[PDB]
C-alpha cells in the first residue's frame, strides 16, 4: 500500500482544488492497518496542521476530523495525549502560534476539541486541554 506520508502529502497538498477523499480516507484506513500507524499519523498531522499555508492546515484538520470519526481506540488514544493536544494548543493560543494563525483554523480546532469532549468522554486529557483553554478565555 501507500505510506502514511504519501497519503497525508496528497490529502493536504496546497495544490488541491477540492478535498481528496481517496487520500483522506486512505490515510485513515492505513493508520488503522499499521501497528505503529496511529503514533506516526498523529506526528504527521500535527506538523501539517501547524503550516503557515492555510489550505494545507485546513485540509489536515479535515483528515484529523475524518479519522477521529471513523477510527480508533488506538487512534483516539494517540490524539488524547498532551503530546498531540499541545500541538493544537500551540496553534490556538496567543502565547504561541495563535497570533499568526487565521481565525478559521483556530475556530476549527476549538470546534473539534469540543466535539471530542462530548463524543469521546473517556479521553479525559482532551477535556483537560479544552477546559484549560476555556479558563483562559480562549474558548472562545
Amino acid at each position: 500500500p501507500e505510506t502514511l506520508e504519501a497519503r497525508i502529502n496528497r490529502a493536504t497538498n496546497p495544490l488541491n482544488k477540492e478535498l481528496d477523499w481517496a487520500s483522506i480516507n486512505g490515510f485513515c484506513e492505513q493508520l488503522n492497518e499499521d501497528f505503529e500507524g496511529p503514533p506516526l499519523a498523529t506526528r504527521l498531522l500535527a506538523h501539517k496542521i501547524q503550516s503557515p499555508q492555510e489550505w494545507e492546515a485546513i485540509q489536515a484538520l479535515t483528515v484529523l476530523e475524518t479519522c477521529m470519526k471513523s477510527c480508533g481506540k488506538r487512534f483516539h488514544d494517540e490524539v488524547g495525549k498532551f503530546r498531540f493536544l499541545n500541538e493544537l494548543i500551540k496553534v490556538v493560543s496567543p502565547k504561541y502560534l495563535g497570533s499568526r494563525t487565521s481565525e478559521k483554523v483556530k475556530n476549527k480546532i476549538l470546534e473539534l476539541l469540543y466535539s471530542w469532549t462530548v463524543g469521546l468522554p473517556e479521553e479525559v486529557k482532551i477535556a483537560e486541554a479544552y477546559q484549560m483553554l476555556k479558563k483562559q478565555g480562549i474558548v472562545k
Binding site: K81, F82, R83, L85, N86, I89, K90, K125, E128, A129, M132
Partner: peptide, 7 residues
Amino acid sequence: SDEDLLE
C-alpha cells in the same frame, strides 16, 4: 510516555 499539559 507523555508530555505535560502545555499551559
